[PDB]
Structure formats: C-alpha cells, structure tokens
Design a binder for this molecule. Structure first.
Ligand SMILES: CC(=O)N[C@@H]1[C@@H](O)[C@@H](O)[C@@H](CO)O[C@H]1O
Ligand SMILES: CC(=O)N[C@@H]1[C@@H](O)[C@@H](O)[C@@H](CO)O[C@H]1O
Length: 130
C-alpha cells in the first residue's frame, strides 16, 4: 500500500523497529529519520482494517508488555490493533489509549508505551509519506 513514517512531535525522531530486526518481539523505538532502502524498518502502512503494519515484515504494533514491540498481526488481540487518529496512534478498540514515548525521553533509542491520552507532545505524531 502507501507507506509512511510516524514522526514524533516531541523531537522529530521517527518510530523505528530496533536494529531492523525482523523477529517477533523486536522493540519499537525512536530513531533519527532515514531515507532509501534501509528505511524499511521506519516505514508503515495501514491494512484493510486501518491497522498499522510494518513495511519490514508486515508485523503489527503490539502493546502486550510494558514497552511496545513487533508481533505478527492477529485480529483477535486488541493490543495489536493500532490506528492513525488525528495526530495520535490510538488503540482501535479504545481510542483514548495512545502510543507514548516513555517519560518524554528525547534521546534516540527511546521506548514507547501505551498510555491514556493526556495531550502531551510525547503522544503526538506527524504522518509523513515515504
Ligand atoms: C539500517 C539499520 O539497521 N539501522 C538501525 C536503526 O534504524 C536503529 O534501529 C538502530 C537502533 O540502535 O539500529 C540500527 O541498526
Ligand atoms: C504527563 C506525562 O508526560 N506523563 C508521562 C507518560 O506520558 C508516560 O510516558 C509515563 C511512562 O511511565 O511517564 C509519565 O511521566
């Protein structure tokens, strides 16, 4: 489909599958934006259900643990269905739960959690076409 970056309003860094790792359970972190073929682990698309998937391996965003990680999409696991909702990345079944850069950590490599929406910039994202 059409690919995009999910770019933090906090620091302009983008969501990134850490180390371009194709394995389940790879952490999704913030990282400086890359362009070209190597950017595949920073590129995302929405499936037929509007659910976000990685260009790398078609994995979903998973929020089953304290930090977010990649997992194969399963439509029966509510914590693997994340959608674009304005400038937030929201849980399909609960739009008030959103992706959140933990403790507003501005450094590269920062981890992301699911948290209730509170309007802080650490929960705000710009969708940028590839
Ligand atoms: C091309 C590539 O692999 N780059 C990744 C980078 O995107 C980021 O995930 C970083 C985290 O330390 O690891 C690097 O290996
Ligand atoms: C208002 C605010 O930014 N609160 C943050 C929250 O968004 C989340 O990142 C959490 C991680 O434990 O840390 C809190 O300090």
């Amino acid at each position: 489909p059409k690919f995009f970056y999910i770019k933090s309003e906090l620091n302009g860094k983008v969501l990134d599958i850490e180390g371009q790792n194709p394995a389940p359970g790879s952490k999704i972190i913030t990282w400086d934006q890359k362009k070209g073929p190597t950017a595949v682990n920073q590129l995302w698309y929405t499936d037929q259900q509007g659910v976000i998937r990685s260009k790398l391996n078609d994995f979903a965003i998973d929020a089953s643990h304290e930090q977010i990680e990649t997992q194969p999409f399963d439509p029966n696991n509510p914590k693997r269905a994340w959608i674009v909702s304005g400038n937030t990345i929201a849980q399909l079944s609960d739009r008030d739960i959103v992706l959140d850069i933990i403790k507003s950590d501005k450094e590269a490599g920062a981890h992301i959690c699911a948290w209730k929406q509170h309007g802080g910039p650490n929960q705000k994202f710009i969708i940028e076409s590839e």
